């Protein structure tokens, strides 16, 4: 990873643009979405669990990232995400607070030959650590529905704002 010190030394080399190389960014947000193991064209979001429910639970004017999308968000989206083309959920209760749980459906996973060396989920919220969490299981766990483990997802960035 990008050091001065890995910059100047690299730089005798011929590259002299510093951390331009280092730093890669994603021109389309929508680009490299990852598409469900089922056909559901959206909606894989809300599966197994919903509970706290909010396809416009969340308060639009808290949330930044410097009308309908698929389900009646009329909360805005974050880095040019097409509500049209990405479903949106939420957790934030207006009137009483009550515990929230939320399960997805099984998302295709392609073959390791890709550009992005990670995997993203643009968030918002007041959450911690410990909340949001991707739960790799096999193919033939998954129709079992049993996970075989989970790798917790770490956020940098403002809370609660998008990120």
């Given at each position: 990873?990008?050091?001065?010190?890995?910059?100047?030394?690299?730089?005798?080399?011929?590259?002299?643009?510093?951390?331009?190389?280092?730093?890669?960014?994603?021109?389309?947000?929508?680009?490299?979405?990852?598409?469900?193991?089922?056909?559901?064209?959206?909606?894989?979001?809300?599966a197994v669990t919903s509970l706290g429910f909010?396809?416009?639970?969340?308060?639009?004017?808290?949330?930044?990232?410097?009308?309908?999308?698929?389900?009646?968000?009329?909360?805005?989206?974050?880095?040019?995400?097409?509500?049209?083309?990405?479903?949106?959920?939420?957790?934030?209760?207006?009137?009483?607070?009550?515990?929230?749980?939320?399960?997805?459906?099984?998302?295709?996973?392609?073959?390791?030959?890709?550009?992005?060396?990670?995997?993203?989920?643009?968030?918002?919220?007041?959450?911690?650590?410990?909340?949001?969490?991707?739960?790799?299981?096999?193919?033939?766990?998954?129709?079992?529905?049993?996970?075989?483990?989970?790798?917790?997802?770490?956020?940098?960035?403002?809370?609660?704002?998008?990120?």
């Open positions: 990873a990008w050091s001065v010190g890995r910059s100047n030394l690299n730089a005798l080399t011929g590259k002299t643009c510093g951390l331009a190389n280092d730093v890669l960014v994603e021109q389309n947000a929508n680009a490299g979405m990852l598409t469900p193991i089922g056909e559901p064209a959206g909606q894989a979001l809300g909010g396809p416009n639970g969340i308060p639009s004017d808290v949330s930044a990232d410097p009308a309908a999308g698929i389900n009646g968000s009329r909360a805005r989206l974050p880095y040019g995400l097409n509500p049209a083309t990405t479903p949106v959920l939420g957790s934030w209760r207006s009137g009483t607070q009550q515990p929230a749980v939320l399960r997805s459906a099984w998302y295709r996973l392609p073959d390791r030959d890709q550009a992005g060396p990670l995997l993203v989920v643009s968030a918002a919220g007041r959450f911690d650590q410990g909340e949001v969490e991707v739960q790799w299981a096999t193919d033939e766990q998954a129709a079992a529905n049993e996970p075989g483990g989970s790798i917790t997802f770490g956020d940098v960035g403002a809370a609660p704002a998008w990120r």
